[PDB]
């Protein structure tokens, strides 16, 4: 397919869907800044606190690189809405939930941030070059978040308390993946990202995640 | 020059531990003080800076705590780890930064005053602390540079002056908190400059000159 290097190369018909895709991703990552911030001080170990600092730094930098992409689209009201968004007025329900306990941080990183990586791997093939380049550079940082959470899962002592957190966040991660299904299918095909709304992504996410949970010593969520 | 804890005489150990503890507590308190501003700073560049400062202070603070592990002071390490707003050593470390002008004034004046002390600690006889103090100077100087730019660009100059007038005497008070340390022990550790009046007089003089160059009124203590 032919690439779209600039906003000038994007037809007016595609702008609203492309803006909404970038807005949704910017809001998701900036919400993580609020959700993970209490754990800079309260994470159980030194290495854990250092990781929370890295993730917060990564999501904040990712988030404002996405918002900087929107400046080229002349959508000042969308940018102001993203900037003023706080817990309770984020787009996704999963973005309006605080992470009160350490097992919520682990389960959220592994399952919700995990589900977001499945979407990011689709966006790396987007016809709009500024977004596909930005999505590709973010994958390595998100994979280190999953790797850390996988290690925290294996090392967690209260396996019953951890399972309870997995059982809470797993269906919410699945519901989050369904939130793209309202986007224009014709616009997604033109942007080469129609894989976002197919059932195969959700079935593949459930299958692989349940396989990883088993391998980490936890019960599958079905 | 003292390369390890084995090389440190017993009569300096308590003073050296207290110096490292005080610095570790100051920097970890900044994590709590600056954390609300990751989301609430007024601009994108401001939020990015708060992330960098939080990351810097958290990494240096826990590197300072790692030094105390060889001194056999597990109760001191546990006290530092459990410290939260209200039980930090310094009064200035128990004050939240409620408004953006408090963040600017705190960075420029309190973190500024801490850089004056850090420049003295870079010459400490105890090698693991002097090396650690030297590596943070560049990171702390970027915090001051940012706050100087935020000062110049601040629109409500009267509201900014109020924040300066509040934090300047508290930064001066903070510098006096080393005056309870053993003077003989500080000379032996080559850090006696910490308790000299020249440091406080030089800090007030330079800060007031720096304040005027940014378009603000001097503070007389």
DSSP string, A99-138: --SHHHHHHIIIIIHHHHHHHHHHHTT-SBHHHHHHHHHH
Token readout for B190 is: 């080559």
How far apart CA A32 and CA A23 sit, in angstroms, is 14
Task: Count CB atoms within 10 A of the CB of residue A47.
Answer: 12
A218: DSSP letter: -
Contact B171, B110 (CB under 8 A): yes
| Cβ contacts of B54 on chain A, cutoff 8 Å | 40, 53, 56
Contact A17, A184 (CB under 8 A): yes
Q: Is A17 helix (H, G, I), strand (E, B) or coil?
A: helix
How far apart CA A158 and CA A205 sit, in angstroms, is 25
Q: Which fold has domain B1-221?
A: Ferritin (1.20.1260)
How far apart CA B22 and CA B133 sit, in angstroms, is 13
How far apart CA B114 and CA B27 sit, in angstroms, is 10
Sequence-separated (6 or more) residues with CB below 8 Å from residue A37: A56, B35, B36, B38, B39
**Domain limits, chain B:** 1-221
Q: Which of A34, A50, A64 sits opposite B58 (nearest CB)?
A: A50
Which stretches of chain B sit within 8 Å of chain A by CB? 28, 31-32, 35-36, 38-39, 44, 47-48, 51-52, 54-55, 58-59, 62, 65, 84
A101: DSSP letter: S
Query: Nearest CA to A74 among A18, A112, A113?
Result: A18
How far apart CA B89 and CA A157 sit, in angstroms, is 34
Count Cα neighbours of A130 within 13 Å in the Cβ-side half-sphere. Answer: 19
How far apart CA B63 and CA A172 sit, in angstroms, is 38
How far apart CA A178 and CA A180 sit, in angstroms, is 6
Instruction: Test B58 with A53 for CB contact under 8 angstroms.
Output: yes
Q: Which of B38, B62, B65 sits opposite A60 (nearest CB)?
A: B38
Residue A216 backbone phi and psi in degrees, to 5: -90, -5
Angle subtended by helix axes B197-213 and B111-121, to nearest 10: 130
Contact B136, B61 (CB under 8 A): no
Instruction: Test A40 with B59 for CB contact under 8 angstroms.
Output: no
Sequence-separated (6 or more) residues with CB below 8 Å from residue B213: none
Q: In which residue are the tokens 């007089």 written?
A: B201
Give me the CATH code for the A2-222 domain, please: 1.20.1260.10
Resolution of this structure in Å = 2.4
A196: DSSP letter: G
From residue B178, give the alpha-carbon distance in Å to each of A69, A188, B33. Answer: 49, 64, 22
Q: Is B125 helix (H, G, I), strand (E, B) or coil?
A: coil
How far apart CA B132 and CA A20 sit, in angstroms, is 46
């Amino acid at each position: 397919m032919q690439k779209l290097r600039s906003v000038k190369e994007v037809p007016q018909d595609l702008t609203n869907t492309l803006v909404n895709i970038i807005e949704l991703r910017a809001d998701f990552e900036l919400a993580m800044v609020e959700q993970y911030s209490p754990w800079l001080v309260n994470a159980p170990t030194v290495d854990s606190r250092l990781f929370v600092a890295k993730l917060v730094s990564d999501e904040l930098n990712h988030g404002w690189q996405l918002v900087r992409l929107l400046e080229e689209f002349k959508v000042k009201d969308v940018i102001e809405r993203i900037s003023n968004a706080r817990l309770g007025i984020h787009k996704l329900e999963v973005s309006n939930l605080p992470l009160f306990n350490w097992e919520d941080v682990i389960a959220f990183t592994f399952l919700v941030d995990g589900a977001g990586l499945y979407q990011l791997k689709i966006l790396k093939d987007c016809s709009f070059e500024p977004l596909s380049t930005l999505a590709s550079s973010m994958i390595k940082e998100e994979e280190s978040h999953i790797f850390f959470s996988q290690n925290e899962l294996r090392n967690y002592q209260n396996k019953n308390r951890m399972q309870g957190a997995i059982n809470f966040w797993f269906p919410r991660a699945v519901e989050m993946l369904h939130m793209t299904w309202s986007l224009n299918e014709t616009h997604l095909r033109d942007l080469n990202i129609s894989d976002l709304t197919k059932n195969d992504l959700i079935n593949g996410y459930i299958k692989t995640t349940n396989e990883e949970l088993k391998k980490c010593g936890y019960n599958e969520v079905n």
